[PDB]
Amino acid sequence: SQSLDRLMNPLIDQYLYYLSKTINGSGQNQQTLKFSVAGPSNMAVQGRNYIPGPSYRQQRVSTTVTQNNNSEFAWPGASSWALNGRNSLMNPGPAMASHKEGEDRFFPLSGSLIFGKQGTGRDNVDADKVMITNEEEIKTTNPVATESYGQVATNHQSDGTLAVPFKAQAQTGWVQNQGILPGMVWQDRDVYLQGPIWAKIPHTDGNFHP
Amino acid sequence: DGVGSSSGNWHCDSQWLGDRVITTSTRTWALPTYNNHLYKQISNSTSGGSSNDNAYFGYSTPWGYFDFNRFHCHFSPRDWQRLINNNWGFRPKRLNFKLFNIQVKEVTDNNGVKTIANNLTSTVQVFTDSDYQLPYVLGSAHEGCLPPFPADVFMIPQYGYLTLNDGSQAVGRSSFYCLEYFPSQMLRTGNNFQFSYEFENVPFHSSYAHSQSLDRLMNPLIDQYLYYLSKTINGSGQNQQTLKFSVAGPSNMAVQGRNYIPGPSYRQQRVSTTVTQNNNSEFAWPGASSWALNGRNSLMNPGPAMASHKEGEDRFFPLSGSLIFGKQGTGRDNVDADKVMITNEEEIKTTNPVATESYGQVATNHQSDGTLAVPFKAQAQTGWVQNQGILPGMVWQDRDVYLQGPIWAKIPHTDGNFHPSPLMGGFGMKHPPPQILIKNTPVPADPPTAFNKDKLNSFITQYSTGQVSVEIEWELQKENSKRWNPEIQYTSNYYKSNNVEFAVNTEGVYSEPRPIGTRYLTRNL
Amino acid sequence: DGVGSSSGNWHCDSQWLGDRVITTSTRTWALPTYNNHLYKQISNSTSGGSSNDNAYFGYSTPWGYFDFNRFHCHFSPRDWQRLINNNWGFRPKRLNFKLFNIQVKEVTDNNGVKTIANNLTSTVQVFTDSDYQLPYVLGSAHEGCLPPFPADVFMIPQYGYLTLNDGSQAVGRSSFYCLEYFPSQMLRTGNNFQFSYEFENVPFHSSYAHSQSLDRLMNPLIDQYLYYLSKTINGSGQNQQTLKFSVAGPSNMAVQGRNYIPGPSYRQQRVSTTVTQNNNSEFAWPGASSWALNGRNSLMNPGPAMASHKEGEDRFFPLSGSLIFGKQGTGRDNVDADKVMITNEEEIKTTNPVATESYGQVATNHQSDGTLAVPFKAQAQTGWVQNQGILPGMVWQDRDVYLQGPIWAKIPHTDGNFHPSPLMGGFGMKHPPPQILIKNTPVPADPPTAFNKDKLNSFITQYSTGQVSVEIEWELQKENSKRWNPEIQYTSNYYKSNNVEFAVNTEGVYSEPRPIGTRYLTRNL
């Protein structure tokens, strides 16, 4: 009933500061370093103790087929892993939130369990012939399956040094897959009445959260 | 008991045992009535601020709470020096909390004149959320704590919490808590409150730097019996490809085989305190490492514990990788760099990657001459690794704690967490010290003589005062080095100055000179 | 004891045992002085209102009383959900009542300035009418109870009663009660009051709906071995009268022989919330089912427990057959339909007749061809049965209880009663929880120096404040269904909204969204 990014007291500031301004408005040679308190008015920059669990991005498919691309992408365009030179669909992969708030028409390509209804045939059955489960309850701690888990810095922003006269602005890349980091919390996939109860952990030297 | 007898004594000493230091601190508090005894709902629209990343929904409460989740609440600067200068680690053991000499005072306003009389029969309500069934707001580094100087009198901060929000709106899962639904203890000026807590087993905080680097961990006199590829060609020409190997030894330590690797990274922007070297653009928010949750972005702040800067680069700090404290009398917004003190994590550069570097490089292709598939000869290409998650064989140190900084955080109750040491530093606990909630009991002014079913909004204005004492027992790890060399120690300087550091000035305001960390002693890796 | 020590603590939790849930609730009350310490006699002429049906005679008292005869006084919405969602029944077991931290405050008026000082020596009088020898005014659904939200402060309602009236006049049998004739307990700010009560054996309230109808109680696969008259003639013609019989089976369930019949009825007018379907006339009072007593008419309101409407007709409600609650901030008179919430009794349509239908029909003549007495051939005629009293073989369910609604009623002390379950819902008891009467002890202002035999009408203006706690133990009936199907449950909705249901808004006012009943689980008939 509480989100991982909404875990503070909305009435009191934080006694931690964040960089808020790097320049003093339009112009040349106007670089400053201003700091402000993280508080309830700016919850995005607030310092936090724990971060959302790991991610492995999946393609977003909508049950309104007109919004889908007019191409075949079920296999080409599917997140996969390789073992000894052959590819397996991720299916269903790490437990991720199936969709963002207000987007129930979208499901990950192979991120959810899909059950047949009753008398459903083996091949090429219509969407209404199957039921797609969702993992929207875990969007409070787990990243959305079809989003990209934030962004990282990908360069050094600069004005100018001896090495080069090329001034680089800050550049960010998208983090499509994130492995486990310390301080990371997550929930597992749900169980269903239709679904399995137990699995055998493979007998290996190492496993994580089996 | 009674009006004329005191229900406790002042006790703010420190006692150093064998391996235990017991800190006690007494402060005088004042508790106002918050919200006019109401449970107002708050949003970003309630205060008018509009940004999806900043949108919130929650509740303001008429209760205050006690925060002593900072080290300066329990250690004098001298005690902190005595701790950090000869101890490899420390951790909290048990906590004792007392609340005594409570006095409720009624303030009256006659023609704009304030007269304060004490109300001997009014009460104050106190309880500890011992079952952890309230939102926990300690552990967010909030400016409401017990003051560092024992002679200061502090206001108790108002308690409030946030729940799930759909922008400014609530959702079905949003939870509302009435704090009056808990059993409280009622106190009227003869009564006191006592609370005892045992800390769960936390690891010792590493109160040392490493005197050895992770890449310099071998014997510099002997080779390694492992070989590395050293030459792939035989000099200039065509069709001159070879495979030569050589022993990894002391002359080439970079290629030496190693058992352990530096801890994980999440790259941050580098900002210098010499502003002329910074880019002439606004990049504080755009150009800041962030994470997203449910479609909104949070500053990393401070993120994984990383070395703040490389050797010889002290002017540079990560954009949001360090804790920044205000000095004294520093204002809330757009204060100058000299008005704040930026902490650094340079002691952990022996095991942790530098916060503004990129954790090495990986291969990004197959180098080749030519195959049947293609005639395109590709040379070896490498990409930069900006963020690295945990790998096996990876070692790291956590963020330092400061005298100014927090002590503990509550580990969020989740299925999984990894290394749940708080990112701002301190001891992560599933069951931290419980919140202590305190409220003046509302006293209605006077009801109308005819009955009315409405809920009596007229009240007598009053506030409470009292003394609070906190006693923490700390377990210590005594430094046991065989190092011949004298060590680095925290010290004050013997140079004439206007004021003594960590004292009061002529005004009488106490200030703290710089942020003192706990890593001065050294250990081998 | 004393001024500086508190005489009780705050305790407003809920504890769920095996088959017992113990609710505790603490509230802050304010008690004014009522009637200037007088025992005024009141009538309909006292307030001027003139109507024989509304005529009354009675007494206003300087005492207040405590009412906690509503479910929201003891259950949070979450606790109510936890109860109604998995329990087939519940009933109260024992009651505990506490009164502590009393403070009497003297208000003074100097030149129109209100100054409130506390009076440490004044008392408050409390007693419980444990022998039930006062008129019982709990059980009339009065707006004076403990507030649903624990953080609210409430005024104590003034106690008063009615006796026998001859219009506006009293008669010889009219009884007057001096409440000061009872032994009270006197309390001055160091004292507390404790009261324990055991509920008499009441049946469990049926916290379930029936998953089976009373007319659908047979096996739909097998005939019945009973016959019914199916044909009385052989088609069109004259002098063609026959007597054919056929087996009652699954094809004709209406004529099937049954062992039990629906409970009693008292027809009410049907009013729709779509006002265009209502008649363009005033019929709220004229056109309302009523009963008469000693020549004056009372609205039935709500009368026997009947199904509010038939399947597929939710816009219709009986004129006075349902409980109607105000929402929040709803005004006293002529408020709009959307300003109130109308409860329904649709779960009991499986056994109880629909409130606005007429309970079937009876024969009203002898059908005949022709006899010696008359040559008049009469066909069978039926009348409508608008009101049906109890018959043998008759089964019914009682009215539901709501979180907003009452818990118990006092059964009137009479020679005979039938099924004395209160008509507004709850547990009917011969000896309900006793009334707790409370009064500020009058403090005379100052007597004249020469003696005067008059009764000292000059008094010091003062009011009391305190905390009250109520503890009820409830016995539960755990649902033990073998139903394969998932059941209907009370739930909140997961859709973005401005406020959270059953919380406070930005103003800080607590509101309850809809009236929650206790019938969500199902049982076979």
SS (H, E, C) C456-487: CCCECCEEEEEEEEEEEEEEEECCCCCCCCCC
> In this complex, do C465 and B456 lie within 8 Å of one another by their Cβ atoms?
no
Amino acid residing at B243:
L
Q: Within its chain, how far is the Cα of B44 from the centroid? A: 25
Report the residue of B162, B179, B184, B188 to disrupt the C interface, i.e. the one with the largest count of C CBs within 10 Å.
B188
Q: Which residues of B touch A140 (CB under 8 A)?
A: 164, 294
Q: Is B346 helix (H, G, I), strand (E, B) or coil?
A: helix
Q: List, in order, residues 6 or more apart from B504 with CB less than 8 Å away.
A: B149, B510, B511
Give A-chain residues touching B390 at CB under 8 angstroms.
179-182
What tokens does C316 get? 């219709």
Distance CA A123, CA C207 (A): 48
Option in A5, A31, A38 nearest B280 (CB): A31
* Residues forming a β-bridge with C477: C89
Ranges of H-type helices in C397-471? none
Nearest to C503 among B176, B450, B460 (CB): B176
C114, C120, C153 member nearest B442 (Cβ): C153
Which chain B residues touch C144 with a CB distance below 8 Å? 451, 453
| Close Cβ partners of B356 (under 8 Å, ≥ 6 residues apart) | A156, B267, B268, B269, B270, B309, B316, B318, B321
Chain B interface, best mutation among A34, A181, A204, by max B CB count within 10 A: A181
**Which of B111, B165, B175, B178 is the mutation pick for testing C, counting most C CBs within 10 A?**
B178
Which helix H or strand E contains B111, and what residues bound it?
A: none
> How is residue B165 written in tokens?
């929000």
Peptide bond just before B302 cis, omega within 30 deg: yes
Comparing alpha-carbon positions, the chain A residue that sits nearest to B297 is A44
* CA distances (Å), origin A55, targets B297, C229, C314: 16, 75, 49
Pick from B172, B173, B446: CB nearest C116: B446
Structure tokens at C62: 């300087």
Which site among C155, C158, C491, C505 would you substitute to test the B interface, given the most B Cβ atoms closer than 10 Å to its Cβ? C155
Q: Known binder of ligand: residue B345?
A: no
Residue B351 corresponds to which amino acid? Answer: T
CA distances from C103 to B4, B194, B465, C147, C191 (A): 19, 25, 20, 20, 10
**Chain A residues with CB-CB distance to B271 below 8 A:** 19, 22, 33
Helices (H), C209-351: none
Annotated binding residue at C347? yes
Rounded to whole angstroms, the Cα distance separating B22 from B475 reads: 9
Cis peptide before B62 (omega within 30 of 0): no
Chain B residue with minimum CA distance to A13: B142
- Chain mean position to CA B58: 23
Declared resolution, Å:
2.8
C54: helix, strand or coil: helix
Token representation of residue B243 = 């495979």
Beta carbons within 8 Å of C93's beta carbon, 6+ residues apart: C20, C198, C199, C472, C473, C474, C475
Compute the CA torsion angle C16, C22, C28, C33 (nearest 10 deg): 160
Closest of B128, B235, B265, B120 to residue B187, by C-alpha: B120
Q: Which residues of A are less than 8 Å from B283 in CB distance?
A: 22-23, 157, 169-170
To test the contact with chain A by mutation, choose from B56, B270, B274, B293 the residue with the greatest count of A C-beta atoms within 10 A, namely B293
C407, C25 in Cβ contact below 8 A?
Answer: no
Are the Cβ atoms of B333 and A37 closer than 8 angstroms? Answer: yes
Which residues, other chains included, contact C191 with Cβ-Cβ below 8 Å and sequence gap of 6+? C1, C7, C102, C185
Give the number of B-C residue pairs with CB atoms closer than 8 Å: 207
Sequence-distant (6+) residues with CB within 8 A of A113 are A92, A133, A192, A195
**Torsional sign, CA C58, C61, C65, C67:** positive
Distance CA B351, CA B263 (A): 7
Of all residues in chain A, the one with the smallest CA distance to B164 is A2
Choose the closest CB to A21 out of B284, B412, B420.
B284
Contacting chains of A (3 CB pairs or more, <8 Å) are B
**Distance between start and end Cα atoms, chain A:** 26
Instruction: Identify the burial level of C470 via C-beta atoms within 10 angstroms of its C-beta, where 0-12 means exposed, 13-18 middle and 19 or more buried.
Output: buried
Q: In a 3-state reduction of DSSP, which class is residue B524?
A: coil
Residue A173's Cβ-count burial label (10 Å; 0-12, 13-18, 19+) is: middle
Contact call for residues B295 and B52 (beta carbons, < 8 A): yes
Q: Give the 3-state secondary structure of residue B442.
A: coil
Q: Least CB-CB distance to A35: which of B42, B142, B340? A: B340
CB pair distance less than 8 Å for A18 and B320 = yes
Q: Do B39 and C4 touch (CB under 8 A)?
A: no
Q: Which of C477, C422, C457 is nearest to C18 (CA)?
A: C477
Q: How far is A106 from chain B (nearest CA, A)?
A: 15
Reading phi first (left if > 0) and then psi (alpha if -120 to 50, else beta), residue C194 is in beta
Provide the token pair at A17: 């500061």
Rounded to whole angstroms, the maximal C-alpha distance in chain B is 109
Write down which chains contact chain B via at least 3 CB pairs under 8 A. Answer: A, C
Compute CA distances A187 → A146, A206, B213, whole Å. 17, 21, 37
Q: What residues make up the domain containing B492?
A: 1-525
CB contact under 8 A, B447 and C505: no
- Is B119 close to C118, i.e. CB distance below 8 A? yes
C-alpha span between B417 and C303 (Å, rounded): 60
Judge residue A40's burial from the number of C-beta atoms within 10 Å of its C-beta, 0-12 exposed, 13-18 middle, 19 or more buried: buried
Are B181 and C13 a contacting pair at CB < 8 A? Answer: yes
Query: Is-contact B398 B421, C-beta < 8 A?
Result: yes
Q: What tokens were used for C331?
A: 């005004």
Put simply, the answer to whether A29 touches B269 (Cβ < 8 Å) is: no
**Count of domains in chain B?**
1
Q: How far apart are CA B426 and CA B403, in angstroms?
A: 11
C384, amino acid identity: W
Residues in B closer than 8 angstroms to C33, CB to CB, are 449
Q: Which of C89, A51, A174 is nearest to B421 (CA)?
A: A51
Question: Taking CB atoms and an 8 Å cutoff, what residues of chain C touch B446?
Answer: 30, 32, 105, 107, 114, 116, 461, 463
Assign residue C253 a region: left if phi > 0, alpha if psi is -120 to 50, beta otherwise? alpha
B347 in a labelled binding site: yes
Smallest CA–CA distance, residue B456 to chain C, in Å, is 6
Chain B: nearest CA to C460, how far in angstroms?
13
SS3 (DSSP) at B262: strand
For B397: left if phi > 0, alpha if psi spans -120 to 50, otherwise beta; the answer is beta
Method: cryo-EM
Point out the residue among C8, C12, C100 whose CB comes nearest to the CB of B182.
C12
CA C97 – CA C192 distance, rounded (Å): 11
The residue length of chain B stands at 525
Could you give the CA distance from residue C458 to residue C124 in angstroms, rounded to a whole number?
18
- Cα R_g (chain A), whole angstroms: 22
For A22, the closest of B139, B278, B409 (CB atoms) is: B278
Q: What share of chain B is helix, strand, coil (3-state, %, to 5)?
A: 5, 35, 60
B314 φ/ψ sector (left φ>0, alpha ψ -120 to 50, else beta): alpha
Q: Which residues pair with C154 in a beta bridge?
A: C29
Q: How many CA atoms lie within 13 A of C19 on its CB side?
A: 11
In angstroms, the CA C515 to CA C402 distance is: 6
CB contact under 8 A, A52 and B157: no
Cβ-based burial of C55 (10 A; exposed 0-12, middle 13-18, buried ≥19):
middle
* Cβ-nearest to A45 among B279, B298, B325: B298
The response to whether A134 counts as a known ligand-binding position is yes
Helix (H) or strand (E) holding B80: helix B77-85
Cα separation of the two ends of chain B: 58
For residues A148 and B296, give the distance between their C-alpha atoms in angstroms, rounded to a whole number.
Answer: 12
State the amino acid at position C343 in one-letter form: T
Is residue B108 within 8 A of residue B461, CB to CB? The reply is yes
CB contact under 8 A, C28 and B442: yes
Residue of A1, A2, A9, A171 to mutate, testing the B interface (most B Cβ within 10 Å of its Cβ): A9
Token pair in block for residue C72: 């929201």
What distance in Å separates the CA atoms of residue A61 and residue A72, rounded to the nearest whole number?
Answer: 12
Please give the Cα distance from B397 to B308 (Å, whole number): 13
Residue whose structure tokens are 């395109």? B376
Nearest CA in chain B to C36: B449
Query: Cβ separation of A183 and B356 shorter than 8 Å?
Result: no
Of A17, A35, A169, the CB nearest to B283: A169
Give the number of residues written for chain C: 525
Q: Among all residues of chain B, which has the CA nearest to that of C116?
A: B445
Total residues found in chain A within this entry: 210
Residues preceding gaps in chain B (C to N > 2.5 Å): none
Element (H, E) at B497: none
Query: Do the beta carbons of residue B230 and residue B244 sit within 8 Å?
Result: yes
d(CA A114, CA A74): 15
Other beta carbons within 10 Å of B259: 8
Contact residues on chain C for B169, CB-CB shorter than 8 A: 496-498
**Could you tell me which of B73, B63, B223, B69 has the C-alpha nearest to residue B157?**
B63
User: In what helix (H) or strand (E) does residue C229 lie, and over which residues does it extend?
Assistant: strand C227-233
3-state helix, strand, coil in chain A (%, to 5): 5, 25, 70
Radius of gyration, CA atoms only, chain C: 29
The C-alpha atoms of residue A134 and residue C59 are separated, in whole angstroms, by 65
Number of helices (H), then strands (E), in chain A:
0, 14
